[PDB]
UniProtKB/Swiss-Prot annotation, chains A, C:
Native species: Escherichia coli (strain K12)
Family named by the database record: Belongs to the SsuE family.
Protein name from the UniProt record: FMN reductase (NADPH)
Domain of life: Bacteria
Reported function: Catalyzes an NADPH-dependent reduction of FMN, but is also able to reduce FAD or riboflavin.
Entry's induction text: Repressed by sulfate or cysteine.
Gene Ontology biological-process entries: alkanesulfonate catabolic process; cellular response to sulfate starvation; DNA damage response
Reactions mediated catalytically: FMNH2 + NADP(+) = FMN + NADPH + 2 H(+)
Enzyme Commission identifier(s): 1.5.1.38
One GO cellular component, as annotated: FMN reductase complex
Summary of subunit composition and partner proteins: Homodimer.
Keywords: Flavoprotein, FMN, NADP, Oxidoreductase
Pfam families attached to this UniProt entry: FMN_red
Length: 175, 173, 175, 173
């Protein structure tokens, strides 16, 4: 019923930010309550010096607390998630993702950094006590033919996004 | 509705096996068909030298195929899952865990190696294409009071298994 | 001959920042060229939006490029290094640590996060092509009796720091 | 000056073994005493069921003890080192790699699993208390032209091994 999407890219547009876009579209077409957040919504000073009294933080958190699931996306810098995504994740409370389904997406220069999703990003979401984390979707920069206006992906990438969004929705209303 | 439990300890019984026995007991009470495997069901030479014509592997592959979920348990050695368990996971098909809900369990002599679950076991399960991996339970040895004749846990460890197992049951619907 | 020390804590003082302090002292007492950098030396805006034209960045990089080794320290937030440390590491060039010995140090609330050094931090330094990375030192918050004025550690922590600094210096002048 | 090479492939020869043979050849040329082990030197049942009285394990432990460095090589399976190799690492003493310089090598069917070295193999070596772990070499299968009768690599893979091996030699001084 309620989903947070979180773009983790330090720049806009991003190849990663556009994976999240396509999902947002496919999901809005279900009148599911979606709340998109990106890093451009926070003050750099609050994220760096780790200031928990961030007003932006309180509003995101309140929305997170009410969301049934999280779809989070990040470029792969230095064999992990962006540090910029991490500074925010660092501010969330200890059990922020408890009870929530999570869907991680990621892009990278090379397929050689595919394992950053499983070995860097998923443990962090797990530290935050995600109830369940999906397999997720990684795309090397070659699967994205255009991320500037409409996202164009290769059929393979689009398919893998479809499959994962499908799983994601079903997990979002188990009883 | 079929679940596989898979013990990854090289000795049996073990602390991690007792977790699976407890899980079995809770799942049978809910009319799940549960099938238990351990490393002792395979010929060591088939595992260590990766021999794909292992009869047991064929049986275990079929059983897994038709299974909706997997509970896997391992002791933590050298900051990761056991080699012993990994020898078996290495022999499974590329997409063996596709469509499946996976509950990882582990035991460890020191709480210092709690992260072995997230940083070592989960990635390997995700390489087998697990559809979703539950948060899981790490138990330091001292939370497992008896593992030989009847699983007996401290209240906190018991409560955490119970919670995980309920999430696991719900996920299978 | 030339070492960079890098505090990765978002706050000062930090339990982690003080591990780096004790090292800096022990090493200055050898007239080794040490260049201490912390996150307080960078503009939050540059680190977040990933601005490579950071003047602070150019000066750190130039000093890094000339350093024979790096000693880097971080608290353990969410089962990894701080995102704040990461935003900087994200800006360094692709092969920044090539040819250099690296010594990682870290602190955490609980010993349960000891493995964050090996599974989160070391891969990032390795992505940066560290020639060699030392075993390193992790300390739970209980090993630090006081980090505010002089660092007080338990003998065990001090010993483990000594052992690692020893190894560190020897590796810094192989021929 | 003693080096152990340790092949972690479950079949022999393998692509990762050919790397170690190449390394051996380069190290002997520099008057290093090199001792080679592989998984076939151990009884599978001792590895898979973690039996510490394995004679081979005793010999390998002694040899490692007196060794200054270790070159270890493994294929990448299910996004990590081989279970087969891990069964052996799990049987080594707690501080087995203390004081030692370690050079990790790996091979993989897809470059997609290059990070298995940093995210999986290194942590386990560091749990054995390796004094320093070199950057290492990942080679996708296609860079290993022959591994059966004479190690034969593409120029780039050969150049990267050469560089690593020189760093390794210097570190042993």
């Amino acid at each position: 019923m309620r989903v947070i999407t979180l773009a983790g890219s330090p720049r806009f547009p991003s190849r990663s930010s556009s994976l999240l876009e396509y999902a947002r579209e496919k999901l809005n077409g279900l009148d599911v309550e979606v709340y998109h957040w990106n890093l451009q919504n926070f003050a750099p000073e609050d994220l760096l010096y780790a200031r928990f009294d961030s007003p932006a933080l309180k509003t995101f958190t309140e929305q997170l607390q009410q969301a049934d699931g999280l779809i989070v996306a990040t470029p792969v810098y230095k064999a992990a998630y962006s540090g910029a995504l991490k500074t925010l994740l660092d501010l969330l409370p200890e059990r922020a993702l408890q009870g929530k389904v999570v869907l991680p997406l990621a892009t990278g220069g090379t397929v050689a950094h595919l394992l950053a999703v499983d070995y860097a990003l998923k443990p962090v979401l797990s530290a935050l006590k995600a109830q369940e984390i999906l397999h997720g979707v990684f795309a090397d920069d070659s699967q994205v033919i255009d991320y500037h206006h409409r996202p164009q992906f290769t059929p393979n990438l689009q398919t893998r996004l479809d499959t994962a969004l499908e799983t994601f929705w079903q997990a979002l209303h188990r009883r």
